[PDB]
Design a protein around this ligand. Structure first.
Ligand code: NA
Ligand code: ZN
Length: 169
């Protein structure tokens, strides 16, 4: 397993992440969104790997270790927010280049997009902070049913800025 960019679908298996009132699991939206994004990054000429490709829980430290073993330079975690979230955004690690990558991705996520350091999260840290490279956690808006066409639109939006970051950094 070798890859320049690693996609990390948040949660999985026994960890559903956020659950919509209709039962949509963040974990399933995450995997679906990451699978679609991989197709866009491969089309732009990048070797893409995953921390998970199925509905199984991968320990947070193993997500980071797998990325390092694959020789990843960029770590992109894929999440959806609580079902009442209004605005997409990006958390960035304190590692050099993370904030730059987050801002270029946030610029593609439309009106009201935010960026925050991992230190602004509930416990003041995120697992992405262990990755020795640019590392972000994208919250693609609220946990709710998401169509194929919306997944493709989001993938196309963020693929270009990720690929342009990877080319320049
Ligand atoms: Na862990
Ligand atoms: Zn999440």
């Amino acid at each position: 397993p070798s890859a320049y960019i690693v996609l990390d679908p948040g949660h999985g298996g026994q960890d559903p992440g956020a659950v919509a009132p209709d039962g949509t699991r963040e974990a399933d939206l995450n995997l679906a969104q990451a699978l679609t994004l991989k197709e866009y990054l491969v089309a732009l000429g990048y070797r893409v790997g995953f921390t998970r490709t199925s509905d199984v829980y991968v320990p947070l430290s193993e997500r980071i270790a797998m990325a390092r073993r694959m020789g990843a330079r960029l770590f992109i975690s894929v999440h959806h927010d609580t079902p009442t979230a209004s605005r997409p955004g990006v958390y960035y690690s304190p590692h050099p280049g993370s904030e730059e990558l987050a801002r270029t991705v946030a610029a593609a996520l439309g009106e009201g997009a935010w960026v925050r350091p991992s230190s602004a999260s509930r416990f003041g840290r995120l697992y992405i902070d262990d990755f020795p490279g640019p590392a972000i956690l994208v919250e693609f808006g609220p946990t709710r049913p998401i169509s194929r066409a919306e997944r493709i639109a989001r993938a196309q939006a963020v693929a270009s800025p990720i690929a342009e970051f990877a080319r320049r950094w």
